[PDB]
Design a protein around this motif. Structure first.
Motif, PDB file in Angstrom:
ATOM      1  N   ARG A  62       0.835  -1.233   0.170  1.00  0.00           N
ATOM      2  CA  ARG A  62      -0.121  -0.116  -0.040  1.00  0.00           C
ATOM      3  C   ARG A  62       0.813   1.352  -0.001  1.00  0.00           C
ATOM      4  N   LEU A  63       1.980   1.265   0.886  1.00  0.00           N
ATOM      5  CA  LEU A  63       2.805   2.302   0.655  1.00  0.00           C
ATOM      6  C   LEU A  63       3.494   2.413  -1.024  1.00  0.00           C
ATOM      7  N   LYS A  64       4.086   1.075  -1.205  1.00  0.00           N
ATOM      8  CA  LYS A  64       4.960   1.052  -2.551  1.00  0.00           C
ATOM      9  C   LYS A  64       3.903   1.578  -3.544  1.00  0.00           C
ATOM     10  N   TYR A  65       2.519   1.379  -3.654  1.00  0.00           N
ATOM     11  CA  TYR A  65       1.849   1.681  -4.863  1.00  0.00           C
ATOM     12  C   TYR A  65       0.933   2.706  -4.789  1.00  0.00           C
ATOM     13  N   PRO A  66       0.571   3.365  -5.790  1.00  0.00           N
ATOM     14  CA  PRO A  66      -0.279   4.239  -5.598  1.00  0.00           C
ATOM     15  C   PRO A  66      -1.875   3.670  -5.158  1.00  0.00           C
ATOM     16  N   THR A  67      -2.811   4.342  -4.596  1.00  0.00           N
ATOM     17  CA  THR A  67      -4.195   3.899  -4.664  1.00  0.00           C
ATOM     18  C   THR A  67      -4.937   4.254  -5.740  1.00  0.00           C
ATOM     19  N   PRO A  68      -5.527   3.197  -6.461  1.00  0.00           N
ATOM     20  CA  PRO A  68      -6.250   3.555  -7.762  1.00  0.00           C
ATOM     21  C   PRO A  68      -7.415   4.549  -7.448  1.00  0.00           C
ATOM     22  N   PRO A  69      -7.485   5.431  -8.400  1.00  0.00           N
ATOM     23  CA  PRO A  69      -8.381   6.437  -8.047  1.00  0.00           C
ATOM     24  C   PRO A  69     -10.152   5.929  -8.308  1.00  0.00           C
ATOM     25  N   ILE A  70     -10.881   6.301  -7.589  1.00  0.00           N
ATOM     26  CA  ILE A  70     -12.322   6.090  -7.870  1.00  0.00           C
ATOM     27  C   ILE A  70     -12.922   7.094  -8.580  1.00  0.00           C
ATOM     28  N   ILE A  71     -13.774   6.475  -9.653  1.00  0.00           N
ATOM     29  CA  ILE A  71     -14.518   7.058 -10.581  1.00  0.00           C
ATOM     30  C   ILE A  71     -16.035   6.933 -10.331  1.00  0.00           C
ATOM     31  N   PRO A  72     -16.683   8.181 -10.161  1.00  0.00           N
ATOM     32  CA  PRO A  72     -16.231   9.579 -10.178  1.00  0.00           C
ATOM     33  C   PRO A  72     -15.687  10.008  -8.905  1.00  0.00           C
ATOM     34  N   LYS A  73     -14.829  10.793  -8.889  1.00  0.00           N
ATOM     35  CA  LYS A  73     -13.859  11.135  -7.680  1.00  0.00           C
ATOM     36  C   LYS A  73     -14.640  11.787  -6.709  1.00  0.00           C
ATOM     37  N   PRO A  74     -14.434  11.052  -5.571  1.00  0.00           N
ATOM     38  CA  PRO A  74     -14.719  11.517  -4.026  1.00  0.00           C
ATOM     39  C   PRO A  74     -14.155  12.879  -3.682  1.00  0.00           C
ATOM     40  N   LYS A  75     -15.010  13.610  -2.938  1.00  0.00           N
ATOM     41  CA  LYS A  75     -14.473  14.616  -2.235  1.00  0.00           C
ATOM     42  C   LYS A  75     -13.118  14.394  -1.384  1.00  0.00           C
ATOM     43  N   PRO A  76     -11.873  15.289  -1.601  1.00  0.00           N
ATOM     44  CA  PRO A  76     -10.702  14.990  -0.778  1.00  0.00           C
ATOM     45  C   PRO A  76     -10.718  14.528   0.618  1.00  0.00           C
ATOM     46  N   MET A  77     -11.750  14.947   1.373  1.00  0.00           N
ATOM     47  CA  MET A  77     -12.116  14.523   2.756  1.00  0.00           C
ATOM     48  C   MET A  77     -12.672  13.318   3.008  1.00  0.00           C
ATOM     49  N   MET A  78     -13.383  12.731   1.817  1.00  0.00           N
ATOM     50  CA  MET A  78     -14.023  11.374   1.824  1.00  0.00           C
ATOM     51  C   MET A  78     -12.828  10.584   1.581  1.00  0.00           C
ATOM     52  N   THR A  79     -11.997  10.689   0.795  1.00  0.00           N
ATOM     53  CA  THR A  79     -10.828   9.957   0.398  1.00  0.00           C
ATOM     54  C   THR A  79     -10.158   9.722   1.769  1.00  0.00           C
ATOM     55  N   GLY A  80      -9.564  10.768   2.268  1.00  0.00           N
ATOM     56  CA  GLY A  80      -9.029  10.861   3.810  1.00  0.00           C
ATOM     57  C   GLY A  80      -9.561   9.910   4.593  1.00  0.00           C
ATOM     58  N   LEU A  81     -11.110   9.917   4.860  1.00  0.00           N
ATOM     59  CA  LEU A  81     -11.572   9.174   5.800  1.00  0.00           C
ATOM     60  C   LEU A  81     -11.739   7.780   5.536  1.00  0.00           C
ATOM     61  N   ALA A  82     -11.773   7.500   4.231  1.00  0.00           N
ATOM     62  CA  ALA A  82     -11.736   6.069   3.953  1.00  0.00           C
ATOM     63  C   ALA A  82     -10.379   5.522   4.120  1.00  0.00           C
ATOM     64  N   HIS A  83      -9.415   6.342   3.694  1.00  0.00           N
ATOM     65  CA  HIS A  83      -7.828   5.998   4.171  1.00  0.00           C
ATOM     66  C   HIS A  83      -7.510   5.948   5.516  1.00  0.00           C
ATOM     67  N   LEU A  84      -8.376   6.802   6.425  1.00  0.00           N
ATOM     68  CA  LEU A  84      -8.132   6.596   7.819  1.00  0.00           C
ATOM     69  C   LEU A  84      -8.937   5.268   8.182  1.00  0.00           C
ATOM     70  N   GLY A  85      -9.938   4.965   7.801  1.00  0.00           N
ATOM     71  CA  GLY A  85     -10.860   3.353   8.032  1.00  0.00           C
ATOM     72  C   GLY A  85      -9.977   2.505   7.820  1.00  0.00           C
ATOM     73  N   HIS A  86      -9.220   2.735   6.452  1.00  0.00           N
ATOM     74  CA  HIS A  86      -8.259   1.678   6.150  1.00  0.00           C
ATOM     75  C   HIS A  86      -7.000   1.349   7.308  1.00  0.00           C
ATOM     76  N   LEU A  87      -6.679   2.576   7.756  1.00  0.00           N
ATOM     77  CA  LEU A  87      -5.552   2.454   8.547  1.00  0.00           C
ATOM     78  C   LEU A  87      -6.059   1.825  10.011  1.00  0.00           C
ATOM     79  N   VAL A  88      -7.182   1.945  10.241  1.00  0.00           N
ATOM     80  CA  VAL A  88      -7.849   1.280  11.585  1.00  0.00           C
ATOM     81  C   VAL A  88      -7.759  -0.198  11.342  1.00  0.00           C
ATOM     82  N   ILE A  89      -8.075  -0.526   9.934  1.00  0.00           N
ATOM     83  CA  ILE A  89      -8.403  -2.197   9.686  1.00  0.00           C
ATOM     84  C   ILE A  89      -7.119  -2.485   9.879  1.00  0.00           C
ATOM     85  N   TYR A  90      -5.921  -2.096   9.053  1.00  0.00           N
ATOM     86  CA  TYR A  90      -4.642  -2.458   9.282  1.00  0.00           C
ATOM     87  C   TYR A  90      -3.992  -2.540  10.831  1.00  0.00           C
ATOM     88  N   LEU A  91      -4.382  -1.729  11.526  1.00  0.00           N
ATOM     89  CA  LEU A  91      -4.042  -1.890  13.023  1.00  0.00           C
ATOM     90  C   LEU A  91      -4.867  -2.855  13.741  1.00  0.00           C
TER      91      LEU A  91
END
Ligand code: HEM
Ligand code: HEM
Ligand SMILES: CCCCCCC(CCCCCC)(CO[C@H]1O[C@@H](CO)[C@H](O)[C@@H](O)[C@@H]1O)CO[C@H]1O[C@@H](CO)[C@H](O)[C@@H](O)[C@@H]1O
Ligand SMILES: [Mg+2]
Length: 174
Positions: A62-91
């Motif tokens: 996940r660090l090495k690769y880009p995250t594929p974009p979502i189409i249509p594009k979410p608001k930046p805060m929505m992506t941030g939040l999903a990415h935070l949710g992912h961090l919680v899953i990783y942890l």
């Protein structure tokens, strides 16, 4: 391009299968006779250790690769939040099996993973085991809820919003 890499897709769904097996081994343990419990415990811990390794590997990918974009594009805060949710899953899914491992270590008994004998403490530590057991249970229960929310969000994306969130994580081009 538009999908996670095939390796990331493989690992995502492999972990899903392994997590199912880990939960199922514990949930259905009492449906097996006492004589099969060692085997059930072995399946459990072996899945758990596999999951831990794959959770670390997937995070490095996940660090090495880009995250594929979502189409249509979410608001930046929505992506941030999903990415935070992912961090919680990783942890969560790293902490859960680690606590398992430390629990087995501190029990001070021989134990087995992938048919192999594992290390344990030369003396048992009971205060620690009791606490670790309680934490393992709580985090495993938190895991159900988090996977449920996670899967539900994916389904809301795929069926309600009709974006490509889930398709990016699916093996075939559809
Ligand atoms: C993602 C990985 C894992 C999941 C989802 C998971 C889930 C669970 C669940 C649901 C239980 C039953 C808790 C309850 O009583 O309600 C449990 C028990 C247990 N798990 Fe795990 N586990 C994982 C990894 C591990 C690992 C890696 C180990 C050891 C190396 C481990 C060792 C145990 C042990 C010994 C118990 C039994 C507690 C007892 O009966 O005293 N688990 N696990
Ligand atoms: C039916 C079950 C599941 C569905 C439908 C699902 C769906 C998805 C989707 C759509 C993504 C991409 C999200 C995005 O890029 O914004 C994703 C990523 C992810 N999923 Fe799942 N998932 C499931 C099960 C699981 C399970 C059991 C775990 C962990 C135990 C998990 C952990 C993750 C993680 C950590 C990511 C981030 C990318 C990665 O490291 O692979 N998922 N999932
Ligand atoms: C989704 C999870 C399902 C769990 C099923 C557990 C399984 C079968 C396992 C084989 C599955 C076939 C694909 C263990 O049962 C047997 O399993 C053997 C395994 O070799 C054991 O050696 C044997 O001793 C054990 O009794 C069934 O046992 C349960 O079945 C219930 C009636 O559905 C019984 O009322 C229940 O009380 C029993 O306890
Ligand atoms: Mg990256």
């Amino acid at each position: 391009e538009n999908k996670y890499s095939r390796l990331q897709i493989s690992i995502h769904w492999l972990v899903f299968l392994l997590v199912i097996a880990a939960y199922c081994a514990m949930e259905f343990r009492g449906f097996f006779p006492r004589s099969d419990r060692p085997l059930i415990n072995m399946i459990h811990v072996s899945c758990g250790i596999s999951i831990l390794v794959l959770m670390v590997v997937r995070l490095l990918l996940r660090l090495k690769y880009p995250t594929p974009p979502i189409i249509p594009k979410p608001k930046p805060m929505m992506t941030g939040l999903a990415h935070l949710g992912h961090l919680v899953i990783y942890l969560l899914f790293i902490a859960l099996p680690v606590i398992g491992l430390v629990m087995m270590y501190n029990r001070g008994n021989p134990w087995f993973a992938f048919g192999l004998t594992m290390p344990y403490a030369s003396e048992a530590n009971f205060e620690r085991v009791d606490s670790l057991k309680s934490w393992h249970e709580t985090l495993a229960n938190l895991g159900y809820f988090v996977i449920g929310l996670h899967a539900a969000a994916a389904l809301a994306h795929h069926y309600f919003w009709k974006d490509n969130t889930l398709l990016r994580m699916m093996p075939r081009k559809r």
